[PDB]
Design a protein around this nucleic acid. Structure first.
Length: 183
DNA sequence: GGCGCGCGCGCC
DNA sequence: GGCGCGCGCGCC
């Protein structure tokens, strides 16, 4: 059903494969929840700006993440719209590596984590991330082999998937994964 | 090329 | 939710 939200975050459009297309990620908030959104129509980028209020209908979902394909289904909302501020806070919280270690393979993961160790191999790059509860490997290939970063930088992860790899839960990149290196 | 407008977002 | 530095990018 149609849902009206306020945009909290939205990345710049980026290239990806399976067919090779374009997309960006966004995070939005109703008055009762926050959601991650994959937008596959890059002509909607102007509707997904910080603080813009939009109404989303005729979309699809997948593991709690919204998918938007046709611009025909986003409309501006210019009446008054206020979301409770904890929804904003939750929407911006990065989960703990100790909780990530307790979810099922398949779970999609988004957050900001600091990069403690970078190991580059032939086709894969293992980015070790840490917080005050644990460490975890991020596996990046293709677009995310050997990206520019060093110890102390932080990584913003968008739509990474928890997978068991050599008997341990890791984050691995797929077609829609995005990683941004900060500072 | 490369100015300069004005956002993004980590930090506050 | 505000701030402002760093930057992305339309324009010439």
């Amino acid at each position: 059903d149609p849902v009206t939200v306020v945009v909290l975050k939205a990345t710049a459009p980026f290239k990806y494969e399976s067919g090779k297309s374009t997309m960006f990620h966004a995070t939005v908030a109703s008055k009762t929840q926050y959601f991650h959104v994959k937008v596959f129509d890059i002509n909607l980028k102007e509707k997904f700006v910080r603080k813009k209020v939009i109404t989303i209908s005729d979309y699809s979902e997948c593991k709690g993440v919204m998918e938007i394909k046709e611009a025909s289904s986003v409309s501006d909302f210019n009446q008054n719209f206020e979301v409770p501020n904890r929804i904003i806070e939750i929407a911006n919280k990065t989960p703990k590596i100790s909780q990530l270690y307790k979810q099922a393979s398949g779970t999609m993961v988004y957050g900001l984590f600091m990069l403690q160790k970078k190991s580059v191999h032939k086709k894969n790059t293992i980015y070790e991330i840490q917080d005050n509860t644990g460490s975890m490997d991020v596996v990046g290939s293709g677009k995310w082999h050997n990206i520019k970063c060093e110890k102390g930088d932080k990584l913003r992860l968008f739509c990474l998937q928890l997978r068991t790899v050599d008997r341990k839960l890791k984050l691995v990149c797929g077609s829609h994964s995005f990683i941004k290196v900060i500072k």
